[PDB]
Scaffold this active site. Structure first.
Site, mmCIF file in Angstrom:
data_model
loop_
_atom_site.group_PDB
_atom_site.id
_atom_site.type_symbol
_atom_site.label_atom_id
_atom_site.label_comp_id
_atom_site.label_asym_id
_atom_site.label_seq_id
_atom_site.Cartn_x
_atom_site.Cartn_y
_atom_site.Cartn_z
ATOM 1 N N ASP A 1 0.794 -1.074 -0.179
ATOM 2 C CA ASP A 1 -0.064 0.092 0.073
ATOM 3 C C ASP A 1 1.019 1.087 -0.101
ATOM 4 O O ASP A 1 2.091 1.049 0.421
ATOM 5 C CB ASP A 1 -0.723 0.084 1.241
ATOM 6 C CG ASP A 1 -1.669 -1.172 1.304
ATOM 7 O OD1 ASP A 1 -2.885 -1.085 0.714
ATOM 8 O OD2 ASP A 1 -1.533 -2.215 2.106
ATOM 9 N N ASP B 1 -7.548 -7.751 4.957
ATOM 10 C CA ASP B 1 -6.462 -7.731 4.089
ATOM 11 C C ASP B 1 -5.886 -9.259 4.305
ATOM 12 O O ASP B 1 -5.378 -9.645 3.297
ATOM 13 C CB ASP B 1 -5.332 -6.802 4.434
ATOM 14 C CG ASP B 1 -5.538 -5.263 4.585
ATOM 15 O OD1 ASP B 1 -6.138 -4.939 3.314
ATOM 16 O OD2 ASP B 1 -5.471 -4.625 5.343
ATOM 17 N N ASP C 1 -3.050 -4.638 6.627
ATOM 18 C CA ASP C 1 -2.600 -4.287 8.002
ATOM 19 C C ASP C 1 -4.117 -4.930 9.012
ATOM 20 O O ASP C 1 -3.960 -5.092 10.121
ATOM 21 C CB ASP C 1 -2.902 -2.637 8.506
ATOM 22 C CG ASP C 1 -4.181 -1.885 7.866
ATOM 23 O OD1 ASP C 1 -5.016 -2.505 7.547
ATOM 24 O OD2 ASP C 1 -3.881 -0.757 7.649
#
Ligand SMILES: C/C=C(/C)C(=O)O[C@H]1C(C)=C2[C@H]([C@@H]1OC(=O)CCCCCCC)[C@@](C)(OC(C)=O)C[C@H](OC(=O)CCCCCCCCCCCNC(=O)OC(C)(C)C)[C@@]1(O)[C@H]2OC(=O)[C@@]1(C)O
Ligand SMILES: Nc1ncnc2c1ncn2[C@@H]1O[C@H](COP(=O)(O)OP(=O)(O)CP(=O)(O)O)[C@@H](O)[C@H]1O
Ligand SMILES: [Mg+2]
Ligand SMILES: [Mg+2]
Ligand code: NA
Length: 994
Positions: free
Chosen positions: A351, A707, A703
């Site tokens: 990310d 995910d 996180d």
């Protein structure tokens, strides 16, 4: 069960046929729970030690070792002599080793946990519902809750089951959706439906997600889904549905054993076949029976001589040293056999925000209208100093400091900021920095205002705990914030409805201050404030404003933009439905542009660099973000993902675009794309599915709970150190500092490790090859055992280990991060290399065998049939007067075996050097290139000597060799090896590659 959050509040009460007043009658329960079962996530499947141990004995090699230990145990019970008591040390150790596995394989597993076992940590135990068997609230158990019955939630509760919200008792309802959604703040909830059936969790504002927590308030609801159907449940599935592969090393394991098992068998075929005469020459004499015990005791010898016993322990020993190593460099490898895989990561999808950019908001430019005439426009652009939210910096135009109060446009833009902001600033003494109290993008505004104190209000006569908001609070005493129209993902903006205090700001009753994406707020603007006045937003005035908007967010600046306005004539208070977000876009029209504010989320230094390393590394880097495409892109070139000027249209798609594209282009896009903007949930995984369709080892990083489903299925899932337990326990590595770079740094050790790892592996194998050759000959020729299992083990465990595991430190190549990541399919030993170890082994096999036999055919301290008639040593005590009038017991002499077993030892302490390099001659890479390897060799030798001199030991093995007579003889056998290698190693120059 209802995928309805899009349905009216009565529509649900309808479906379940339940009284929002009474609840579910105990019948409805008995029936609902039998069609829906309990609200809970399925338990785990934990194997017993029984089951565990059994896996520890499911390897072909551990088995081949167990069958052998049986034959040894079986033999060690066939002699009837007082002296033959050390008979139970061979079949005893083998077991011991095999036992030490099971032992370790179990404790190994016993301490590892399930990513899913981590989820159930989100399920609350008790719940609060309303049903037909009481008016007052009933407090039951999460699981006993069924889809339907009315549940109520309070400020301090964890949300059980997914609840479509029926009514909000509090004045407001706050929710912490953090764990399983986009961004967490005190997210509010409302009762009206959400039209779109295909809505993203965050957009389902009338919902209560299971596991999330209700931050503030107390509302009532009807349960939509229960159990595994619940939003998270929907996840737990994903994870459980996925299966991950064996590291391309473990893969290669089975491979080798499969074969190491074929070969072995074949030998016994050639072997049994060389002694076929025994079928057309026997005189049925009896010495038969003692000839079967030969094949049996030579077969288990064949095993501890084909299997690299000690290797397993030398590898993991190599890895754990590396774990701790990367741990120093902030990288945390969760499970190690994964270091390899990391070592060859093909791509890294990380990310942006959290890792790539520091995520430190700071306004750098502003811009307010200066004047509008005919078609002539005039803006007032600025610059703001200060990285930190810390209220310390200066406003300048054309690089010339500027008082802020000196301009009206700013004084408003400034208030707007301070008021249409739910964040603020706070200072701490424990560390002395100014911290982000609320949301960064807001806490930066609050900061901006502080820096440009529009009111020339003395703030230097004030402490630092007060400096934090001295300029804001003042603008806060300049209006009564009646209420606020929260941000909504469709109008991409928010607003505060305010009133002034009775005397000072009486001028114009209530007004409304808005802030959001320039596109929206700007259209909604029908006017534009020029200092203290307004004007009809015109054609030119607009372009010019968007032109600067686009300049900032697309230029090298890569700035984020906020367009600020105020609604001068706000609708009458009582005519607004402050609790039905749909209408919030209507209340935000007829707006007067006030100016936009640009701010930066600076990339973290080393990233630019760390991005370059990947280039030379050939490791691809995909940037998954929340920025708009136009900004994602820019940002990228700013870091090096792209090179300013590069055409990026095809290499970067958007959350939507991607969904549009057909499975066909989906895949394509993915092998080349490097920037996914506005990514959504499924994506992180679909991609990781395409990146897999290209046999690409790919890294993924999230996180939170959402995910996990990917992090799991990614070859290498990378979880944030500032991430959620679950995710971490889902990824195969964790970053304490979240720095993207830490990923690359980790991809480095990853290769290094595997290069040494790699070689030291080739070392112990070839030797194992050699050993085999020894027994083959020892057997094919009839010659007395030259080497014994009980020996071979010691070697492959200790005299061979200390040099192997020291090899794990072989100085890292200089070109590591300059070669594409390794291939997984690339085999450890093939091509001419095969040929080489095929020769060294064929060498030691005879060097040893011949050694033992030598002491039998030429050494003075034990004369033997120089015509090679030692071959039939089997028959001696029999035809005692045959061709020997000798002491038949000499064949089982210790001296001959300590001969070979010492030529073995050495040949390896030597072969373990034709290893520091693969083809670079030792004179091109002297052994002193590794201080460890040398030292180690010595520790092993003083050791090997330990088995000659320390009385208890030798009797277990063989007696001492006569120094300079017998040892010197030893040296004139082994040492030459090195040549044999340096020679093959030279065949390098005589071929192209190098
Ligand atoms: C070893 C000894 C022997 C005798 C053997 O059969 O090796 C063959 C073999 C199998 C080979 C090769 C070898 O072929 C021969 O030498 C032909 C046989 C002639 C000798 C017989 C005399 C008539 C190999 C070894 O050698 C050469 C030089 O030719 C190289 C290579 O091997 C590798 O790259 C190894 C990497 C594998 C990956 C390493 C994994 C093993 C490490 C773990 C050890 C487990 N053992 C153990 O005891 O653990 C406990 C818990 C205690 C049970 C591999 O061609 C392999 O086939 C493959 O698929 C490969 C890719 O694999
Ligand atoms: N504090 C704030 N208040 C109102 N609008 C904001 C804002 N911060 C940003 N915006 C605007 O609202 C739009 C969306 O905010 P969103 O919540 O998706 O941002 P984000 O970029 O912080 C997610 P990520 O942090 O993952 O990149 C932005 O694109 C911006 O134009
Ligand atoms: Mg934001
Ligand atoms: Mg996230
Ligand atoms: Na995996």
């Amino acid at each position: 069960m209802e995928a309805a959050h899009s349905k009216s509040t009565e529509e649900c009460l309808a479906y379940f046929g339940v009284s929002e007043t009474t609840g579910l009658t105990p019948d409805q329960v008995k029936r609902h729970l039998e069609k829906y079962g309990h609200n809970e996530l399925p338990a785990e499947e934990g194997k017993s030690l029984w089951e565990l141990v059994i896996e520890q004995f499911e390897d072909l090699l551990v088995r081949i070792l167990l069958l052998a230990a049986c034959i040894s145990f079986v033999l060690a019970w066939f002699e009837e002599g007082e002296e033959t008591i050390t008979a139970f040390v061979e079949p005893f150790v083998i077991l011991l080793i095999l036992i030490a596995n099971a032992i370790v394989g179990v404790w190994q597993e016993r301490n590892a946990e399930n990513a899913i076992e981590a989820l159930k940590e989100y399920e609350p135990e008790m719940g609060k519902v309303y049903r037909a068997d009481r008016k007052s609230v009933q407090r039951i158990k999460a699981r006993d809750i069924v889809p339907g019955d009315i549940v109520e939630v309070a400020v301090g509760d964890k949300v059980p089951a997914d609840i479509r919200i029926l009514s909000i008792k509090s004045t407001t309802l706050r929710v912490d959706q953090s764990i399983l959604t986009g961004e967490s703040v005190s997210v509010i909830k409302h009762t009206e439906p959400v039209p779109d059936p295909r809505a993203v969790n965050q957009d389902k504002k009338n919902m209560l997600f299971s596991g999330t927590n209700i931050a503030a308030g107390k509302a009532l609801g009807i349960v939509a889904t229960t159990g595994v159907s619940t939003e998270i449940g929907k996840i737990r599935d994903q994870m459980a549905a996925t299966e991950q592969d064996k590291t391309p090393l473990q893969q290669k394991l089975d491979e080798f054993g499969e074969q190491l098992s074929k070969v072995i068998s074949l030998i016994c075929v050639a072997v049994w076949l060389i002694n076929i005469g025994h079928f057309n020459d026997p005189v049925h004499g009896g010495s038969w029976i003692r000839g079967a015990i030969y094949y049996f005791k030579i077969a288990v010898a064949l095993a501890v001589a084909a299997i690299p016993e000690g290797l397993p322990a030398v590898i993991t020993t190599c890895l754990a040293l590396g774990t701790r190593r990367m741990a120093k460099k902030n990288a945390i490898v969760r499970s190690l056999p994964s270091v390899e895989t990391l070592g060859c990561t093909s791509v890294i999808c990380s990310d942006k925000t959290g890792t790539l950019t520091t995520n430190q908001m700071s306004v750098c430019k502003m811009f307010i209208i200066d004047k509008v005439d005919g078609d002539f426009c005039s803006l007032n652009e600025f610059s703001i100093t200060g990285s930190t939210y810390a209220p310390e910096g200066e406003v300048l135009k054309n690089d010339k400091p500027i008082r802020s109060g000196q301009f009206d446009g700013l004084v408003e833009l400034a208030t707007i900021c301070a008021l249409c902001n739910d964040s603020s600033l706070d200072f701490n003494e424990t560390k002395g920095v100014y911290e982000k109290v609320g949301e960064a993008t807001e806490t930066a505004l609050t900061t901006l205002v502080e820096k440009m104190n529009v009111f020339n209000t003395e703030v230097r006569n004030l402490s630092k705990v007060e400096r934090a908001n001295a300029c804001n609070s003042v603008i806060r005493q300049l209006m009564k914030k009646e209420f606020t129209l929260e941000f909504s993902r469709d109008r991409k903006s928010m607003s505060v409805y305010c009133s002034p205090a009775k005397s000072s700001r009486a001028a114009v009753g209530n007004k409304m201050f808005v802030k959001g994406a320039p596109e929206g707020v700007i259209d909604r603007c029908n006017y534009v404030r020029v200092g203290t006045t307004r004007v009809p937003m015109t054609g030119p005035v607009k372009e010019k404003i968007l032109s600067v908007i686009k300049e900032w967010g697309t230029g090298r600046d890569t700035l984020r933009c906020l367009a600020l306005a105020t609604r001068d004539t706000p609708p009458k208070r009582e005519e607004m439905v402050l609790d039905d977000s749909s209408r919030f876009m209507e209340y935000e029209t007829d707006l007067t542009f006030v100016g936009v504010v640009g701010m930066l989320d600076p990339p973290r230094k080393e990233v630019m660099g760390s991005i370059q390393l990947c280039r030379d590394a050939g490791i691809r880097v995909i940037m998954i973000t929340g920025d708009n495409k136009g900004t994602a892109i820019a940002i990228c070139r700013r870091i090096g993902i792209f090179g300013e000027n590069e055409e990026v249209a095809d290499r970067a798609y958007t959350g939507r675009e991607f969904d549009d594209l057909p499975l066909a282009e989906q895949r394509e896009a993915c092998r080349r794309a490097c920037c996914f903007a506005r990514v959504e949930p499924s994506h992180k995984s679909k991609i990781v599915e395409y990146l897999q369709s290209y046999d690409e080892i790919t890294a993924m990083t999230g996180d939170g709970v959402n995910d996990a489903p990917a992090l799991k299925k990614a070859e290498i899932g990378i979880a944030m150190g500032s991430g959620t337990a679950v995710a971490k326990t889902a990824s195969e590595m964790v970053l304490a500092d979240d720095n993207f770079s830490t990923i690359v740094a980790a991809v480095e050790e990853g290769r290094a490790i595997y290069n040494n790892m790699k070689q030291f592996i080739r070392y112990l194998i070839s030797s194992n090859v050699g050993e085999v050759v020894c027994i083959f000959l020892t057997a094919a020729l009839g010659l007395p055992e030259a080497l014994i299992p009980v020996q071979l083990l010691w070697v492959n465990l200790v005299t061979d280990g200390l040099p192997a595991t020291a090899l794990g430190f072989n100085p890292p190549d200089l070109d590591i991060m300059d070669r594409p990541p390794r291939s997984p399919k690339e085999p450890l030993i093939s091509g001419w290399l095969f040929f080489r170890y095929m020769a060294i082994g064929g060498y030691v096999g005879a060097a040893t065998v011949g050694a033992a036999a030598w002491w039998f055919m030429y050494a003075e301290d034990g004369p033997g049939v120089t015509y090679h008639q030692l071959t039939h040593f089997m028959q001696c005590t029999e035809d005692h007067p045959h061709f020997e009038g000798l002491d038949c017991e000499i064949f089982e002499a210790p001296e001959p075996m300590t001969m070979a077993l010492s030529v073995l030892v050495t040949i390896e302490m030597c072969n373990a050097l034709n290893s520091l390099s693969e083809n670079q001659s030792l004179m091109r890479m002297p052994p002193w290139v590794n201080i460890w390897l040398l030292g180690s060799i010595c520790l092993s030798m003083s050791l090997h000597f330990l088995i000659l001199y320390v009385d208890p030991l030798p009797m277990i093995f063989k007696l001492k060799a006569l120094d300079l007579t017998q040892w010197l003889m030893v040296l004139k056998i082994s040492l030459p090896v090195i040549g044999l290698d340096e020679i093959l190693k030279f065949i390098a120059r005589n071929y192209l590659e190098g």
